[PDB]
Amino acid sequence: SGNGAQGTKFRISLGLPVGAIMNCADNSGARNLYIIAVKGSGSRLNRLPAASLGDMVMATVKKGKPELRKKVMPAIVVRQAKSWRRRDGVFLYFEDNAGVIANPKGEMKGSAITGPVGKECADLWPRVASNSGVVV
Amino acid sequence: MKVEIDSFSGAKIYPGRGTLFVRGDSKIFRFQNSKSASLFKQRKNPRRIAWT
Amino acid sequence: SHRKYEAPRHGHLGFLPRKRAASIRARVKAFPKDDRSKPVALTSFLGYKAGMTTIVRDLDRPGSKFHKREVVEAVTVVDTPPVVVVGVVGYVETPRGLRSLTTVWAEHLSDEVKRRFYKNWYKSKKKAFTKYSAKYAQDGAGIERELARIKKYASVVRVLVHTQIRKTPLAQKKAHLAEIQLNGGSISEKVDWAREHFEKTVAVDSVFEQNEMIDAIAVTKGHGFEGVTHRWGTKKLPRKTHRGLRKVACIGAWHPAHVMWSVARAGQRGYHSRTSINHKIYRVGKGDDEANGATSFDRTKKTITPMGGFVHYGEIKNDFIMVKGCIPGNRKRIVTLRKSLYTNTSRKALEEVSLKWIDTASKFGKGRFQTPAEKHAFMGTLKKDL
RNA sequence: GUGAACAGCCUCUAGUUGAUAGAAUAAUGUAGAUAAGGGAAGUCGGCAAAAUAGAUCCGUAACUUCGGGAUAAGGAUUGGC
RNA sequence: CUCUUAAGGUAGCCAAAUGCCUCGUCAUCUAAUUAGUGACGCGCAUGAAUGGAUUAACGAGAUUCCCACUGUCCCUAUCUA
RNA sequence: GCAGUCAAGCGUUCAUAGCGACAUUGCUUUUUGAUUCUUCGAUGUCGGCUCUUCCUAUCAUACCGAAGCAGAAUUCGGUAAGCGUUGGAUUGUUCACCCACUAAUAGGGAACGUGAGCUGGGUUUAGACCGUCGUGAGACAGGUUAGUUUUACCCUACUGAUGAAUGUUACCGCAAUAGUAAUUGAACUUAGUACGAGAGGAACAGUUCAUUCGGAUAAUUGGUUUUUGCGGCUGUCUGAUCAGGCAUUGCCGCGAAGCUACCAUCCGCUGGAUUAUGGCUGAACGCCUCUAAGUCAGAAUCCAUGCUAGAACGCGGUGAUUUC
Ligand SMILES: [Mg+2]
Ligand SMILES: [Mg+2]
Ligand SMILES: [Mg+2]
Ligand SMILES: [Mg+2]
Ligand SMILES: [Mg+2]
Ligand SMILES: [Mg+2]
Ligand SMILES: [Mg+2]
Ligand SMILES: [Mg+2]
Ligand SMILES: [Mg+2]
Ligand SMILES: [Mg+2]
Ligand SMILES: [Mg+2]
Ligand SMILES: [Mg+2]
Ligand SMILES: [Mg+2]
Ligand SMILES: [Mg+2]
Ligand SMILES: [Mg+2]
Ligand SMILES: [Mg+2]
Ligand SMILES: [Mg+2]
Ligand SMILES: [Mg+2]
Ligand SMILES: [Mg+2]
Ligand SMILES: [Mg+2]
Ligand SMILES: [Mg+2]
Ligand SMILES: [Mg+2]
Ligand SMILES: [Mg+2]
Ligand SMILES: [Mg+2]
Ligand SMILES: [Mg+2]
Ligand SMILES: [Mg+2]
Ligand SMILES: [Mg+2]
Ligand SMILES: [Mg+2]
Ligand SMILES: [Mg+2]
Ligand SMILES: [Mg+2]
Ligand SMILES: [Mg+2]
Ligand SMILES: [Mg+2]
Ligand SMILES: [Mg+2]
Ligand SMILES: [Mg+2]
Ligand SMILES: [Mg+2]
Ligand SMILES: [Mg+2]
Ligand SMILES: [Mg+2]
Ligand SMILES: [Mg+2]
Ligand SMILES: [Mg+2]
Ligand SMILES: [Mg+2]
Ligand SMILES: [Mg+2]
Ligand SMILES: [Mg+2]
Ligand SMILES: [Mg+2]
Ligand SMILES: [Mg+2]
Ligand SMILES: [Mg+2]
Ligand SMILES: [Mg+2]
Ligand SMILES: [Mg+2]
Ligand SMILES: [Mg+2]
Ligand SMILES: [Mg+2]
Ligand SMILES: [Mg+2]
Ligand SMILES: [Mg+2]
Ligand SMILES: [Mg+2]
Ligand SMILES: [Mg+2]
Ligand SMILES: [Mg+2]
Ligand SMILES: [Mg+2]
Ligand SMILES: [Mg+2]
Ligand SMILES: [Mg+2]
Ligand SMILES: [Mg+2]
Ligand SMILES: [Mg+2]
Ligand SMILES: [Mg+2]
Ligand SMILES: [Mg+2]
Ligand SMILES: [Mg+2]
Ligand SMILES: [Mg+2]
Ligand SMILES: [Mg+2]
Ligand SMILES: [Mg+2]
Ligand SMILES: [Mg+2]
Ligand SMILES: [Mg+2]
Ligand SMILES: [Mg+2]
Ligand SMILES: [Mg+2]
Ligand SMILES: [Mg+2]
Ligand SMILES: [Mg+2]
Ligand SMILES: [Mg+2]
Ligand SMILES: [Mg+2]
Ligand SMILES: [Mg+2]
Ligand SMILES: [Mg+2]
Ligand SMILES: [Mg+2]
Ligand SMILES: [Mg+2]
Ligand SMILES: [Mg+2]
Ligand SMILES: [Mg+2]
Ligand SMILES: [Mg+2]
Ligand SMILES: [Mg+2]
Ligand SMILES: [Mg+2]
Ligand SMILES: [Mg+2]
Predict the structure, then answer these.
(1) Which of C5, C69, C71 sits opposite A45 (nearest CB)?
(2) Were both Cys, which of A110, C97, C146, C171 would link to A26 (CB 3.0–4.6 Å)?
(3) Cβ of residue A18 near strand D, that is under 7 Å?
(4) Is residue C54 less than 8 Å (CB to CB) from chain A?
């Protein structure tokens, strides 16, 4: 999470450190999302901040509509490739890393999400959950 | 509790076991272990794998 | 001078010296506060760690994403045959601390226990408690009047119990003997209870119970001499560093001109005494039972031992405690299980659990089958058989 | 023999089997490997490592002293019978 | 037009391995650039075989960035001699 | 660099809520200087990396007092160093400056901590280009490029490991002393409430999670592979086959076991005494006053509980003690 967020994530395995580039699963016109910082993130000497499913990240768009580039913006993680472990006992993992552009309240800039979305993310951000395709 | 089935080896997947893969489209995949997972990532074929 | 950036220190200074324990049996350093109003009780219990397995159960935690849902948890199964009382020891308050005043032993002592007092049993003349028993012979007096003094002195009464190690798949024939504090009412009623339990048996279900949090006192699996990197946690030095990099770089400032008690050095890792608390009891096994591993839901007649036996341990043919998560020490090693030193209302502490399913597949590999019944009821018939 | 080959790898003739030895396999090393997710965020600096690679057939930019640039780049293929 | 010791910086070129001020100003590249490049030039102290400017090809030379690559790192673990 | 005394002024009004001029008393030794006492038969000279510990002039976190404190936010002050104080772009830099996260991104010391610990980017040998200077050889805290980072087996210290002697040998124990640990954020709810004209907008109790740290652990998932365990492949060699050798483990796929990861899972206690402060009763002083006597409440503090070691010259209970 970070805030603007409804509910609470149980901890899930991190896979998207600073510098990770993930796919942009929305119709915003952005193709990349370059993670420059993670919202929750604590501090530890030389730990890269790393996001996981359904966290809010600060990101920049490396590829897409010119208007959408050379600036930082919140994004929300809807898919991660790093396998994580649900309390129901299953280690699952999506096939790529996707994120959706969002404002600080959590409201997507887009209106549609290509790809499936992990439920943990959907439960965190209703507005994400709205425009979502298949969830989990 | 539910037992699943390996979508490669046709094995029984009791809870906690193996891995769950959520492909591009949304087709969910299950492997009881790292072996049938590896064969799947290798693009082998259950129909030609004698123990499946 | 003032480190460029801050970080918390590596390691815990409260678990020093990182030296090898002085007994593979970890010492119960504390017993619960006695409430001398309840029946006479054992406070801890001996047992052998047998291995782990997985569980399934609905969680009861109102206000959680996973409330009224199934979770899968890891558990450890400790092999717990009934223990046997062979004496009681009497401790008196002094301005120098608790003091053992006398110990009184049972008349007949099992071979297992006797073995404990020898280094070379086989070539011994086994004279272990041979003269002591005579104290009983003369109708009483001797013994009779030592119990007498534990009664009038002694602020605390411990029993001497020992494991029946032979019920265990363990090869070790020598048994384990430990003092266990009695926590039922009145000194007198305590030594009475001990007296009456001489040579007799005590089982777990008479001490522990389901949903109860208990502590686990054992000696950590050893690893011998360890470098600083793994022993303390310490960052790895860069690739380019000459003379090795699994070190720490600055063992100290110039002043104090002494390597200090608080910096990481290589040495022993493992084989330490740990007192791990708040492990919740998910199952009290009955040895006579043949549905040890069964459930109100999963009705099938199976015992707790996984297919192929607990790896490096064997089968559980005895009573057992099955506890949530993990406990210190490794398979085959003696554990003390102590009941909590406090009354935790954690709500997590208070949750009553009902197991729905107990994993009983093989652990010696990527197991696929719970019962050989099930295996064959899937594989078909093989080249052997029929 | 393989192969473009006095390459590498295996062999025949000939020649050696000589470099203190035994028991263990802690830390730390020297030398050789691998690593989920991320992918230079490490660092003075991609140092070190990794990646590419043979051959056949397609394809190939700016620029240029018109000779080059050029294996530019970018693709497909490759066994056995 | 003028002062001065013979004259008084042309053609070019540039914060360049030559610029003090200086981390120059503008533009560009980045989330962010004492870095890089393109430009500007009263240029402390550029400048014409004390060679100036251009320049294809070439370089175990100095430097910037991209793609690929990866245990350099996040953050360590494991194996062999 | 930091802190005071004065109180002209600022602060609608009002010196002192928060500030404070003209003057003036101090403190500090991470600045720079001044000196030249120590080292020139030699104390390795910047930065960073790594790690420990200390100071407090406190940035965060606990509890308070104050306000020009309505609420929210903030600011001033007390007890407080128990606990934390980060990820990056440019630079050899310390410094600086931006982006970004955050509860907060406090300032310092430890031979300007730390080179038989690293690194060697800068600096400052010898090669070389420029520019300024010089007739020249050459010079230049001007720019630039390339430039060997040695030894520990000794003592001590630190980490772990044995161990003679107290009749012998064994078992169970005591606890002096020493160490000691947890940390921080959010959501829900309280509540669109208290307060407020509006804008806005809290907290205690309760619930769920998370950050950082610590200790274990290996059911599970993942990593590792000389299980050279099974299979596949290239070259060659054993006449063929079968089955094998050699290719410094020939290659590739899977691969149990062990080891192992916020890449995995579990676990991380509760009593007291205080501090600031606010009070009680109460004189001094027939009033008044938290204080003088006495005394209540009270903090991330302290002391215990708990947790680690167990004094090898601290101790207790108990068993057996020789025909070769
Ligand atoms: Mg760093
Ligand atoms: Mg800009
Ligand atoms: Mg595996
Ligand atoms: Mg500091
Ligand atoms: Mg180590
Ligand atoms: Mg070196
Ligand atoms: Mg296993
Ligand atoms: Mg010869
Ligand atoms: Mg030799
Ligand atoms: Mg290998
Ligand atoms: Mg990797
Ligand atoms: Mg990539
Ligand atoms: Mg850096
Ligand atoms: Mg960098
Ligand atoms: Mg450089
Ligand atoms: Mg360089
Ligand atoms: Mg290289
Ligand atoms: Mg590699
Ligand atoms: Mg590879
Ligand atoms: Mg041409
Ligand atoms: Mg073909
Ligand atoms: Mg003149
Ligand atoms: Mg002219
Ligand atoms: Mg001319
Ligand atoms: Mg110029
Ligand atoms: Mg030029
Ligand atoms: Mg320059
Ligand atoms: Mg860039
Ligand atoms: Mg750069
Ligand atoms: Mg330029
Ligand atoms: Mg010139
Ligand atoms: Mg000339
Ligand atoms: Mg010319
Ligand atoms: Mg060259
Ligand atoms: Mg006023
Ligand atoms: Mg006034
Ligand atoms: Mg003011
Ligand atoms: Mg001097
Ligand atoms: Mg000298
Ligand atoms: Mg010295
Ligand atoms: Mg030297
Ligand atoms: Mg203070
Ligand atoms: Mg106060
Ligand atoms: Mg006022
Ligand atoms: Mg106000
Ligand atoms: Mg507000
Ligand atoms: Mg405010
Ligand atoms: Mg002040
Ligand atoms: Mg401290
Ligand atoms: Mg941070
Ligand atoms: Mg100093
Ligand atoms: Mg120094
Ligand atoms: Mg030194
Ligand atoms: Mg050195
Ligand atoms: Mg140097
Ligand atoms: Mg240098
Ligand atoms: Mg030189
Ligand atoms: Mg240089
Ligand atoms: Mg060189
Ligand atoms: Mg020496
Ligand atoms: Mg004697
Ligand atoms: Mg509401
Ligand atoms: Mg108002
Ligand atoms: Mg709030
Ligand atoms: Mg660990
Ligand atoms: Mg295992
Ligand atoms: Mg033959
Ligand atoms: Mg045949
Ligand atoms: Mg041979
Ligand atoms: Mg050879
Ligand atoms: Mg081989
Ligand atoms: Mg008072
Ligand atoms: Mg008083
Ligand atoms: Mg007074
Ligand atoms: Mg009173
Ligand atoms: Mg009091
Ligand atoms: Mg505390
Ligand atoms: Mg504790
Ligand atoms: Mg002891
Ligand atoms: Mg002793
Ligand atoms: Mg000694
Ligand atoms: Mg003794
Ligand atoms: Mg005796």
Answers:
(1) C5
(2) A110
(3) yes
(4) yes
